Symmetry: D2
Subunit: 350 residues, 4 copies
């Protein structure tokens, strides 16, 4: 069908597997379904206060290899068990990082990292990976950049995050008010806290947004509202993790009529884009936690099997278990890190 | 179909008329299609620096009544023909205003302003309105809050705008890189200029984003980049229209390899939310324009048949031709203001 | 998507405008909707036994030109009004004739009679034609060859027929049990009556059949049973119209527990494929009717503006208002034949 | 969406999993794909006249239990391997038997035999069954009652049949002209042979028919013609298997330009609805074959693990391996009847 003045800047547009196809091929096993249900209920209590543990969303910056991802998941699953009594460990399974610039479009948009853009392969690979991880008993945390992807993966998400650059977007807020899991809004790029707070209030109400039915047709979604949303401090022009800021944030939250709780992102802006510094932020935060700090309900750490990152866009033989986006701490620091956190929660415990 | 851990916060979700249904029922008449082709070409020239005229996106804050909206159009169309050598008048046909708070969800989401949420009626009403306006010879400018609505109306848009709360959203940038019309990114809420500049650069590159085919099915869209994007100064905590700022902005664009050009929004934050102050901003801006400021390729004015706004909640029978969202200057000030700008453009010519 | 051992004999398969698109573009006008509502009730009243009037499905064998079709309609409409007291005239608007062999695939499958197979144009042309006809006051009768087409046109059909070659088809029976209009089953090709009788029974029950939603998705339809079905005698190896056969048929019907009512097809096998002989059948039948025969509720006549038939694959240009499938009596004989029936109906009455 | 005069006799209509969902969940394993490809090639050589082996479509009348069907399959696969130089054994996997009104609607329409009508469960169950059967090495033969089901299972069918009640239906002829597997048309109910002969010719040509894309959307299909179609003699008011009839048929075929070859159904009308008599028909037929009849390229036998049949309406636990539709010869007679047929084929060979 040819319409006038239509699709002028569209190189190409093609049907995507309908959600139902992905659900039918990779249905949630009984374990996977449990892992999800339980991890959601658990995060709900921590946010409701009825639990003194720390939510810990730790994992690779972005996932580009299911093999490494599942090995990583295996290790993280062990620690999840060990520190089970203090922490509620959840894997950060993110498939793409929003780039103002160019770069790899992620596991879903371009599974083969060769600009082939086999997105239907992406969905398959992505969903199977989440399915496997959840099946093994390890909950997963993911990000939601648009209003359509949720239909293919939300049911395997125990926790999700609306990034900094979209926290103020009405549509993303409306989306969050309909997600079946706890949502965490990041503070503005420059460090602005108001946006995230308003977001939290908006997510709590009922909304309408366009997306697609599980059969893939365009649809209007009417949400109920989501009360399990909290803020995520990822720094601005200067870190947000200091007790000085926590104090500030705790203020604004109550001022807005929302529980004074926050999650702290050791990476990104709080890490000054230096994966090494995540260990330092851990120091300051662990102290706050142990020194009787309750408002902090969770943290976020970018870690992989191998520290640092590597250039994919330079035509280099990628190394296994090493992030190809933001730099992540190695598995050594990750363990030490988690152990410290576990204790700071024990200290604080009283 | 019942899935585990699914749609826990979804009150309801229903099929939405596929785009093809709207296109088939309301196809572009030959006039409408010309109107759209021509006005897009015109704005392209102004943005390429080959037309000393001014792009003027003027019209109701939000449209809630096709009748008034069509009367308004008839009037604006007259001036459009009159001042056509100084200005390139384009009607602001917006259907909804993003709200944190509560409020009417707009003509599309709730055509009957009674929370009946007859969105399929919305699309028919909206698309038929744009169709009529364009058919009369008056181009229309709209805003795009999501990645799906475009499919139902973009072909009747001669110009579009990515609002302040979304200018930094990667998806909305990607979406802009695929629209068939010039796009205008607003500066951040607090006044931040960088976010709109980065946006402009990104929208010029080819991107991938999910949406739906004209047949209504979940699809992946590959754009080809949009070079007809510009910034829109709508003020921050303090107005942006002063030659002081304009000078800063022009510097930012040039430093980012972009043409020093800007559109100035007389309303919203530049008007301090006082519809009457739009007349004042007009003074200062007509000043710079007459003075020979060529970085100002266009302005935006919220105006209706009758000035001021009114409420829906009040229970009093809505007043004809009067905004139910942001306050707008009446038709009298409008005719006045347009004639000033007309002269200002002449001034900058001699 | 590439599947093994799949589509080996498919030259090509393409999406079809979803029904909703055709409904949105060509909604039934008031006059059209009523014309259908009244014609159905009226035919129902007849099958009920409370109307001595005769249902007369008369019209071109197949329609290939909207212009001649609407002229024909205009004329038939006049008579429809004139003989309103004795006959319930309904136009036969058939788009295709099932051919073992080759030949034109009909107005819908190939609107342009040039093998271009523009089916989406067919749907639009066909639907608009029925819409105009109805809007003028003339009900329409059509045939249903598959389970999908109904979704695009049934709402404009006041009466439908399941042809001889499909009367014994389970799917077509299930389909008829869900049509919103009276359905008429024809007796088998060789003259068999049992098949049509079983069909009338089966169609009276609720069934399940696959088709598509108004949105174009594959769906499961659950009908509620259709009690307005009757048999159509179209002859076998030798005509069926004689009182001898009528008598046997009425008996078979009662024997099967169904009302003893029949519709007689003057054309096809009862006419021995001799369009002229339709006038003779009219004589024998008008006789039974005038003689008190009440089981005859209706008749079917193939007639056009110009009698006879012409060949499409003959390459030769086409003569206006002349069938390109089965030969039809001209408009002169039509007006004559209709009036005869009118009188025969008066006879049976007064 | 509510339309005028629409869906008046529709109790309900719901989306059906799109084909792509079944294909994604149950993709053909390599073996299954081979089994299917090879058996189609084999049956092709037979019909082409380049193989003296006999095609044997034997199996339950209908399948209501995957577990027994798989046991049957295992037994039959063994004989398939043994008698492979004489017979090309293909399992009859039919899910439903057309009934005038009352009765179980089949494994697909009602998997749970409790009127729950879990058709999506049907497709999953049916497709998985065919998938496992083919994967084990046993080809499968099925029937196609509508134009939509093929999309979900045809890729697992090595041979298919158009039943007696639909052989004369144009849409089913068109559909056969597009199937990727050899098709068998059954003679009319009353024994008529012409209808199946015409069908074979029709299915040989290219046609158009509506159905749905693999994505589930209403679509128009353009076939390329099917040359691997043959007749199936299943008796009329009296059996068709006698050499007398086989002689008439062979003439009818040659008279129509078709190779004189037939498949003889030992069951149904040829068996006078007496499962025991299938053994008798086998006698007369093995006779003809052994006596040098090269026109008999195949036979069809209704057989299960246990002879006879049983009712659902009875209310007693169902017997394992026992038809709930037409009566079938049990397993012992099957091994018998096959071994006979094998020798006959061996006979005719020398
Ligand atoms: N299925 C999502 C909700 C959703 C519905 C529709 C569109 C987008 C998201 C969930 O369970 O979280
Ligand atoms: N059709 C739109 C572009 C578009 C396609 C697909 C999704 C979103 C937008 C235009 O002409 O601008
Ligand atoms: N819409 C048809 C019925 C129908 C529904 C679905 C499939 C086929 C037919 C009618 O009103 O008569
Ligand atoms: N896919 C089927 C053919 C088919 C396509 C579309 C509709 C119906 C049938 C086959 O391989 O035989
Ligand atoms: Mn990162
Ligand atoms: Mn406004
Ligand atoms: Mn005819
Ligand atoms: Mn049977």
């Amino acid at each position: 069908m040819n319409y006038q003045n239509d699709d002028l800047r569209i190189k190409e547009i093609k049907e995507l597997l309908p959600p139902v196809a992905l659900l039918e091929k990779f249905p949630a096993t009984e374990n996977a379904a449990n892992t999800v249900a339980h991890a959601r209920k658990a995060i709900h209590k921590i946010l409701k206060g009825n639990d003194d543990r720390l939510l810990v969303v730790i994992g690779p910056c972005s996932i580009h290899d299911p093999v490494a991802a599942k090995e990583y998941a295996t290790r993280l699953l062990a620690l999840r068990e060990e520190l089970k009594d203090e922490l509620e460990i959840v894997m950060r399974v993110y498939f793409e990082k929003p780039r103002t610039t160019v770069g790899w479009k992620g596991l879903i948009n371009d599974p083969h990292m060769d600009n082939s853009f086999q997105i239907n392969d992406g969905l398959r690979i992505a969903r199977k990976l989440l399915l496997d991880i959840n099946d093994s008993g390890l909950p997963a945390a993911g990000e939601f950049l648009d209003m359509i992807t949720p239909q293919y993966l939300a049911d395997l998400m125990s926790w999700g995050a609306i990034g900094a650059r979209t926290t103020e977007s009405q549509v993303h807020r409306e989306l969050a008010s309909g997600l079946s899991c706890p949502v965490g809004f990041k503070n503005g790029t420059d460090g602005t806290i108001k946006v995230a707070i308003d977001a939290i209030n908006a997510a709590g109400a009922p909304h309408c947004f366009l997306s697609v039915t599980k059969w893939g047709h365009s649809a209007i979604v009417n949400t109920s509202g989501n009360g399990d949303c909290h803020i995520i401090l990822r720094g601005g022009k200067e870190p947000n993790y200091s007790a000085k800021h926590v104090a500030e944030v705790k203020e604004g939250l109550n001022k807005a009529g929302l529980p004074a709780q926050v999650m702290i992102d050791f990476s990104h802006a709080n890490s000054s884009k230096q994966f090494k510094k995540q260990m330092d932020v851990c120091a300051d935060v662990c102290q706050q936690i142990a020194g009787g700090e309750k408002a902090i309900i969770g943290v976020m750490v970018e870690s992989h099997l191998v520290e640092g990152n590597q250039s994919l866009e330079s035509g280099e033989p990628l190394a296994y278990g090493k992030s190809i986006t933001d730099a992540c701490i190695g598995w050594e620091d990750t363990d030490a890190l988690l152990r410290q956190l576990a204790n700071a929660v024990k200290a604080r415990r009283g």
